[PDB]
Structures are given as C-alpha cells and as structure tokens.
Amino acid sequence: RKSQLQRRFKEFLRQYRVFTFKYRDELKRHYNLGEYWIEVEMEDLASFDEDLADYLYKQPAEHLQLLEEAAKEVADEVTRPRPSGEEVLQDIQVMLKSDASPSSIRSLKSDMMSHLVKIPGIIIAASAVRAKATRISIQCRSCRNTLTNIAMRPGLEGYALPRKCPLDPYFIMPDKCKCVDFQTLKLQELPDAVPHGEMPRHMQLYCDRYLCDKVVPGNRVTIMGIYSIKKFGLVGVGIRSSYIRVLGIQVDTVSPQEEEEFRRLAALPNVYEVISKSIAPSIFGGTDMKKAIACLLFGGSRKRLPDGLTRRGDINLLMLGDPGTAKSQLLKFVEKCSPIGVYTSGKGSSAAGLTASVMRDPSSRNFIMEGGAMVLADGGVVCIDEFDKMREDDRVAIHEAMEQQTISIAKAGITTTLNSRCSVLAAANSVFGRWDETKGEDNIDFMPTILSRFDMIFIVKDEHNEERDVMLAKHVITLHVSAEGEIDLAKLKKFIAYCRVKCGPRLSAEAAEKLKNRYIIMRSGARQHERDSDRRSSIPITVRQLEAIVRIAEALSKMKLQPFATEADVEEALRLFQVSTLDAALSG
C-alpha cells in the first residue's frame, strides 16, 4: 500500500549511511537553517531500495509526494523540539538529482509523458516569481460555511470550484489560502545538439517553492522533471500543450584549508615573483608587463572620504604595440583568470554592447537595462581589444566610467547612475600600424584627456632583433610540441578573489613622503621636457598619475596581505610607472 511505500522512503531517509547518515543530518541542518528543502541523490535511493527509484522513474507524480511526506515526517522526528511560535512543522520540497547522462530534447516523444526525464538546454527566458495556491479555502455565498484545506495539485493544473453547497455559491478568500513560489521558464535545445540544417526545439519548465530563481536566462542547464501537460478544465484536435515539471536543476559552465593555503602563499618572500611568472607562462618575455598586469588584477583600494567622495582603487592599463606581440592573447588570459572578467572589442562585442543602455518597453513601460561589458564586469576586469576604435557615445561613456566608476544615464523616463567598478585593460596598435620613431608621439591619436585615465601605458616594439626572434620561434614551437612555481588558473583566481575581498591596504608616512618627492621630480622633469620640445607630449603626467602610483603600491602590498604599503613596494611601483614614463619622456 502507499503507506508501505512512504514507510520505506522514511527508512531510506533515516537509515541511509555513508560512517554518517547523510540525509538525516542534511534534514537537521536544512530545517535548522530554515531551508525546508533537500537534494536527494537518485543513485543513493536506487542503491538503498532500487524499487523506490524505479517507481519514481515510472510514476514520479505520486511517489514524489510520498517521498516529500516521508521527508517531512523524518524532519519532524529529527527536529521536533522548537521554540514557541515556530513549532508548526513545515513541508519540505524534495529536489532530486542523478548522474545519469541527460537525454536529448528530441527524444521527448509522447511515450515519455508523465515519466521522469533529464534533458539539457539553455534557458532563454524566466518569468517573475509569483503565487500559486497549495491550500485554498472556499466560502459559500449563501450559507457562509467554509470548506477549508482544499488540496491543490502542483504544476499547471487549475481547479474547479464545487457547484453544490444556490448553485456555484462558493468564493475564494485570499486571506486564508496558503500559496508558494511559482515560475515559468523557456528552455531551448543546446545549439551544439541542434542538427545542422534544423530549427532548435523548445520546452516550458515549471519551477516551484525553492526552484524559483535558481537560474537566470542564458544559463546552460540540466533539468530533471516530470513531462506533463496542462490540465485546465479540458486543425489540431485533442492537443494539450506539454511542459516539464522541474524537480532538479544543475547549472553547467572557500574552504578554510584554501584560506590557509592563500595565507601561506602570500607569506612567501618571492610571492610577487611567482605571481609575475604565473600569469602568461606560454607568452615569452614582457616580464614588466606581466608584473603590471598582476598589479592591475589585485587592484588598489577604493577610498570614500568623510565628505563622501570616492577614490577609485582599480588600476587601468593600456598597451600600445605592433600587431605582432601577444597582447590579445594576454587580454584573453586576463579575462580567463580574473575572478569577474569580460573580454570585448572597442565597438562592444557581438550583440553585447560595451556600456550599459536604458530603454523603456513601450508596452510594459518598464526601465529595461541592457547591460554592456562595463556593468556586467562590475567588481572585476574588462579587457578591451582594439581600444582605439570605440564609438563617440561609448568614448564619452568610458571617459566618465574609468574615473568615477559610474555610468550616468538619463533617458526620457528616469535618471540613474549604474555602478561600473571595473578595471580596464586596453590593447591597441599605433595609428599607422607599426610604431615608427621618426613620428614619435604622433603614433597615438588618443586625446590627452583619455590617456590621463590610464594608470600605466606600455609601449611594445619589434623593430629589430635576431636572437629574440630565434628564441621566440623556438619557444612557440616548443609550446606546440608539449601542449614548478606556477599557480594554476583556478587557484590563482581564488587567491585573487580572497585578497581583494579581505585585504585593503594604506600607505605609510615614509612611503607617502618618498612618493611625494619622486612625483615632484617627475612633474618638474616632464614640464622641462615639454618646454624643451616646445610642444605638449600627448602623454601627460597629472595628479591622476600620483593616484596610479599609489594604487600600484597598494596592490603590491595587498598581494602580501600586508595592511601597510612599505617603501620597497612604492619603489617597485615607481619602477613600473618608470617603464611607462619611458614612453612619457624618452618617446620624445
């Protein structure tokens, strides 16, 4: 009898071991945390009692109800003692997952209706969380009696009110009916699985209490659900639109041990060196550029003064060079390694603008914010290749954003200031294509204002060398043949995230003094050089460059988790800024 099946589910939940009882303790912790849901591994259920799993696969509709009831009873048995005001037991949604490979959407024929089905896809739209009634109460209009606790079926299955206590005298009381979360999603077939000449198929997913908003459109998802049709008061004849009842969702693509690992990694005397050589090992040369990119990755510290003004702590880097150097490769690595990162071109990307835009839906009249690379990359890195080929609107937008960290947009509907706290890493080629010294300082068309934004500007050249060419060709061939001190991508990314979230340093008095004196000397030298050349170098030095040097020192000290930036790191930051002053001054 169904009671026997529920009893067996209770035994499986209470006594499945692995020693430790996984599901009993999971119920304890979730109910104590208030989650009131669990994730049941299908294979464990099958192993403990294979008949239960087979029943689930053949008749999910009521067997999952039995499992949920059993889980509710077990949770009561494990967490019954509660303080007054919450002792009432809470139903438990039971999500189920399995390692079984998903079945292509094309195999969802009629026969699989009402069976548990696992399919892959890409969610292209998700509806807002809403209210569906699990328990409703109906009151007669004439006799004003009540029929409380009318069980409501899950899924897209409405309900018909009773006709006889007049006739059809009942109305629903909103204030007495219990409802839960609710959401509808559109799942498209993964483009890889779509046959060559063929449209992509679709399906409609229906979420539930805790499955709502577990995914957002664009996620690559694996869905385990109940293939079901709508049940709404009953040339195509007898066709009922079909949908999936979502039960398990898996979205495809820090432990204390790792925290201590990061702590010891930072404590290394040469942590800077190992990080420097651990970003683009495949790319040969450019040690200074790699050090600068590490500094950019770690970033400085954002400061908000008591007056409320904000000093950005994110470094902005620019790289002008011949089209031969591996700089787009460098940007690709940076976007692949930064915790939050996005690669894009000067003119945005493919159907993904650079800066955010705001438009009002003429029908729904909402304020839709189409996010560009900048807003999407908030708190991370935006790698802009071909940074010299922006569009005027985008040029102004980035002009504002790189300094203030905010994009201010005011449309016919509203004014607003989206927060884009992104570190910009820009790549570019000379105006002519190849850097020619004869027209030095004329190889850059950037207006002086923009060049002020970038903390550092690197200049790359390939004008002449034979030994370097031989070494480069042999190194590339060696890399293609093969295909220690290197922090792997995942470990490095997690270390970067931990350092950024945890440690924010500040300068020390002596460091500030040294940087002050050095900056004064740099300003004097730049002014004298500009006077001697009788022209303004299109690569100025401003107090913004002082902020850049301070930020680089802060990043160097943040690598080590040291709260204060010492004199040595300020000297190293000064050297890094000197490797760009080599373009500020030696260029002319």
Partner: protein, 610 residues
C-alpha cells in the same frame, strides 16, 4: 475575540505615552493639531516595548493593523472627541528597521504574504487617482426615503430601484468616496543584477497616499503583501495576483528636508558676521585642494540668488549657472560629484548620456487611452535643484541649444499637436568641460580655447578656467593634500580591511595637517530661505562696477574676456551678492557682499594671455 481585544489593549497602552518619553502622545497631538488622520509609528518602538506585539504585527499585518487603528481612534477620542468624530477611521503607517521584511521587488517572494514589508524601489507606474465609493446615499422622489448603503473594503450591488420599484437617484454629494490609486514599483537598476530584466510589484494607495509618490522617483513603501482574487467563476487556476497594500509611502530623498540645531545655526551666524562665507567655502569640498574662488562660486550656487516676479508676471531667474573648463585632472568632476552628494535634488548627467528628449522633458502617447502624456525629463525633475552636467563639451549642439530657455528663464516649453505645456524647470546648471585640444593652450585666448559660441558662454554667469599649473610649490601642496587623503582611515571602524562591493568636526592631523558636512547642510538649507533686499549703496556700487566692467579700460593688454560682459553679468553680480548675503543671514545686501561678488566676477571674466 480575546486575541483581538488583547492586541487592541496592548496597542492602546503603547499609544498612552505619558509615563514614558511622551513621544507618541506628542505625535498624536501633532496629527490632531495639523488636521491629518494618519499616524506614522516606528516599528523599532514596538520592538523595544513589546517584541511579541511587533512580531505579531509584522507577521500578521491585516488584523493587527485593524486593532492598532481602532486603538488609535480610541486614543484620539480620549485626547479629543470633537476631532475624533470628524474622521470615520484613523489610519497608521509604519517605518524603522524591518529585519528580514526589508526587501526589493526581486526578493519579494510569496513567503511574505500577509506580512508587513518595507520595500525600496523605483516608481514606474502612477495611475490616475479615482474616487472609490465606500458609502452611497440614494434618494427616492416618490417615497421621500433616503437609503444609505455601506461598501466594505473587500480588496458590490449598487441600488437603483426601491423596494416597490421606485427609481432611486444617487446622492453624490452625500455619498462618501475615498481617493485611490495603483502604482507599479521596480527594483533600483543600481542594485538589480546587471543581466536579467527588472522585477517589479504593484502597490495600492488609499487616501492620504494617492499622490505621495510620482513616476520616476526612488521611494520606500511600507505595507501589507496579500493575494488578489479573480472574478466569480466555476473554475480557477491556482495562480493568484499579489499586491502591496501600502500603509506608508516615503520619498527616499531624506536629504530633501530641532531647537538645538536652530540655536547652533543662530549662534554661528551671529558670532562672526563677516567671514562665515569664506569659512564655509573653504570647507565646501575638504577632500579637494585649492580652487578657493571656484569653491566660493559653488557655495553661491548652493545658496542661489533670489527670484524676482514682477507685477507683469515677468520672471528673472534667481539661480546661478556655473561652467568649469579645466585641464585634465583638476578635480572638476570631483567637485561635480560632491555637489551631487550634498546638494538636494542634484540630478547627474553626462555629455551624450542624455540626448534631446531625455535631458529635457518629452511628450508621448499613453498608448492605452490614446491620450498624449508628458514625460519628466532629466532636468524638469531637477526643479528647485542642481543639474550636474559632466563632459559638457561633447554634447551635440542640438542638446546644448535645448537648454538655453531652462538655463535663462527656467521653464521648458514643449508642445506637440495634441498637447502643449511649459513645465517648471528652476534648476541651476553646473557644467564641467575639457577645453578644445584636450589641454588648455595658455598662448591662445580663452575665447578660442572654448569652442562654445558667445551666446552659451553668456548663459553661464560664471566661467572658471582651472589650469593645471605645475608650480613645484603648488604641486608639493597638492600632493601633500592628496597623499594625506589616500592615507586616511575611518576612525576605529576600520583596521586594515577593504571596502565591500557639531559645528566643527574633530581635527584629525591626517585630514587637516572646517565645519561638519551635516552642519553645513543644515545651515545652507536654513539660509536658502532668507530673502535679502538690495541696499542703495550696494546698488550704486554694483552699477559703477558693471559700468567699468563693460568699459574697455577694465581690461589691460594681453588680458582677454573669458566671456562677454552683457546685461546678464549685471544680474549675476546681484545674484552673487544676494548669495553672499544669504550666507550671513543678512536680510539686506550690504556693501561687503556686493564687493565680494564684484571681485569674484572680475576674477572670473578676465584671463591673462601669455
């Protein structure tokens, strides 16, 4: 009902605030004295006095609010039955710290139904205000009988025939209606995840709240979240439509608006009646160094002059428009950011981020009624406020010429064939600019260093050139200020961690080597109300100064005008003088204000050409 009686008794005991600090007794005296019938109660007080009552109110909003309102009506009757008899019901609004209920439209899940929620969001829809009847009165000419029928809040039959089929003529005047509106609120785009579409929620506003919030404003709505029913029908889908029955709507612009503070302001004004303006201006933007004249001028923008409305309805603007042309990295954008952070109703914008109909207001079709509707643009929203336009130069010239009227007469005239209007835009424009060629060529006249035509430069009353002179002493000072700022850490709250994604302030050595921002805000707000009157000697002084300013002799050799001197300049003087008077609570523009504004204008309107 024992439970309801207990709830009402507890609420009435709370409202009976005489043994305690007498806060809510004073609030009831306030609501009765000023003739309003809705009370605002801080939930923190309920938590502090009775946690059980607060939890019950938050978790079961409807009946608890009914009991609270009935207790409120009883208490107001006790304090005064005459007023209490005037209003059928006394309503209640909530505010304070809502522990887990404080959410956004995105986070608003069905778990909060029948609870109290304090949501924050951007208003998207404000429907027309409709009178919803609550009590109808119908008069029968044949039977001379007047019949009253109540309409309970069931959020239906309207009688028309008497018992024996005598027509009933409704008595509109004697009928009782409550004004009612529905708005749609949305999660702030700032806090919404960058990827997915905005999530919104409905709100239903009864009387006292129908128009408390206007479209396109950031608001906080405290209310009850419940489910709406469908219409009568044999079949129903488990779906339910949920709304937020508001009990209070507040503008998040708390900056928009005690005896101790007023006394502080009075004493500060009277102490040194000579240099308060300079002391304030020096304290305007502490993080920034230098630019004393620019800070002074901005301090005049915050105060603003005085508007003149003649007998002929003529309008003379009393707001001050300022332009800051600067070489890169001279803190002009930082000053704009500070003005945004401090000045009330400070609308930001950028060169090409607000094109045409967005910067100014617009006109569209409702698309539902087929009726034309106005659209509050970026600047009409900034009425009686500041508009901070960064990257001013890069604007398309069409947008620039679309600002002259609002800049000068402060009203935007928009009319399409169906509709026409002259929206009020009394805003002061603070524009930032990068001079043509990026950097400022001192060996060129300021006229040709500015690509703007003569007329627009005339529009701006003050035009400040902020050069990036590198004088090694000045560079040393600026670096000292900046590095001291970058070293500053919050007092105690921070110890080496990172930022997550009184008349005089305490004198730190790392920020000083000034007046409080809050105190400055309060003093500026109170001073802004003052309306000084020009004095005869001041008028003569300003007239002579303007006469010389127009005269060629006022400019020596190799010094060029940063902007043409015309009639507007004269008004600027007055306005600036007026502003300087407001800083001292003068009530009379004496000679000191006039001469300070005069030197400010002289500094602004002439630049030495090398």
């Amino acid at each position: 009902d024992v439970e309801l009686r207990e709830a009402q008794r507890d609420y009435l005991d709370f409202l009976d605030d005489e043994e305690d600090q007498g806060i809510y007794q004073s609030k009831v005296r306030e609501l009765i004295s000023d003739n309003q019938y809705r009370l605002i109660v801080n939930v923190n007080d309920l938590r502090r006095k009775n946690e059980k009552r607060a939890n019950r109110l938050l978790n079961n909003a409807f009946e608890e609010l009914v009991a609270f309102q009935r207790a409120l009506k009883d208490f107001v009757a006790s304090i005064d039955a005459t007023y209490a008899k005037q209003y059928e019901e006394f309503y209640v609004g909530l505010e304070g710290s809502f522990g887990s209920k404080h959410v956004s439209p995105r986070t608003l899940t069905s778990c909060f139904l029948s609870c109290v929620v304090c949501v924050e969001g951007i208003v998207t829809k404000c429907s027309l205000v409709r009178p919803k009847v609550v009590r109808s009165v119908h008069y029968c000419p044949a039977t001379k009988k007047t019949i009253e029928r109540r309409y309970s809040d069931l959020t239906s039959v309207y009688p028309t025939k008497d018992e024996e089929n005598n027509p009933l003529e409704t008595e509109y005047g004697l009928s009782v209606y409550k004004d009612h509106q529905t708005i749609t609120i949305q999660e702030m785009p700032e806090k919404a995840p960058a990827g997915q579409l905005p999530r919104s929620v409905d709100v239903i506003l009864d009387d006292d709240l129908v128009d408390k919030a206007k479209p396109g404003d950031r608001v906080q709505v405290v209310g009850t979240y419940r489910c709406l029913p469908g219409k009568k029908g044999g079949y129903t889908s488990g779906t339910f439509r949920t709304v937020l029955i508001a009990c209070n709507v507040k503008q998040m612009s708390k900056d928009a608006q005690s005896a101790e503070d007023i006394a502080k302001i009075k004493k500060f004004s009277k102490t040194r009646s000579k240099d308060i303006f300079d002391q304030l201006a020096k304290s305007l933007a502490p993080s920034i160094h230098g630019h004393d004249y620019v800070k002074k001028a901005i301090l005049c923008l915050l105060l603003g002059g005085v508007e003149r409305d003649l007998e002929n309805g003529s309008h003379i603007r009393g707001d001050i428009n300022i332009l800051l042309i600067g070489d890169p990295s001279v803190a002009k954008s930082q000053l704009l950011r500070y003005v945004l952070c401090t000045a009330p109703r400070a609308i930001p914008t950028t060169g090409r981020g607000s094109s045409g109909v967005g910067l100014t207001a617009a006109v569209t079709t409702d698309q539902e009624t087929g009726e034309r509707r106005l659209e509050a643009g970026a600047m009409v929203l900034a009425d009686r406020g500041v508009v901070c336009i960064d990257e001013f130069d890069k604007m398309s010239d069409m947008d620039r010429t679309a600002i002259h009227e609002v800049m000068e007469q402060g009203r935007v005239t928009i009319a399409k064939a169906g509709i026409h209007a002259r929206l009020n835009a009394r805003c002061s424009v603070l524009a930032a600019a990068n001079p043509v060629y990026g950097r400022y060529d001192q060996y060129k006249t300021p006229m040709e260093n500015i690509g703007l035509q003569d007329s627009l430069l005339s529009r701006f009353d003050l035009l400040f050139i902020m050069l990036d002179q590198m004088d090694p002493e000045q560079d040393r000072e600026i670096s000292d200020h900046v590095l001291r700022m970058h070293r500053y850490r919050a007092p105690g709250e921070q110890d080496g961690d990172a930022m997550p994604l009184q008349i005089y302030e305490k004198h730190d050595n790392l920020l000083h080597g000034m007046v409080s921002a809050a105190f400055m805000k309060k003093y500026i707000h109170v001073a802004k109300i003052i309306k000084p009157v020009l004095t005869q000697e001041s008028a003569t002084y300003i007239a002579e100064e303007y006469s010389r300013l127009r005269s060629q002799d006022s400019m020596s050799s190799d010094t060029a005008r940063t902007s043409p001197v015309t009639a507007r300049t004269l008004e600027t003087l007055i306005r600036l003088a007026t502003a300087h008077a407001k800083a001292r609570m003068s009530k009379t523009v004496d000679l000191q204000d006039a001469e300070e504004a005069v030197e400010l204008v002289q500094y602004a309107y002439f630049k030495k050409v090398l």
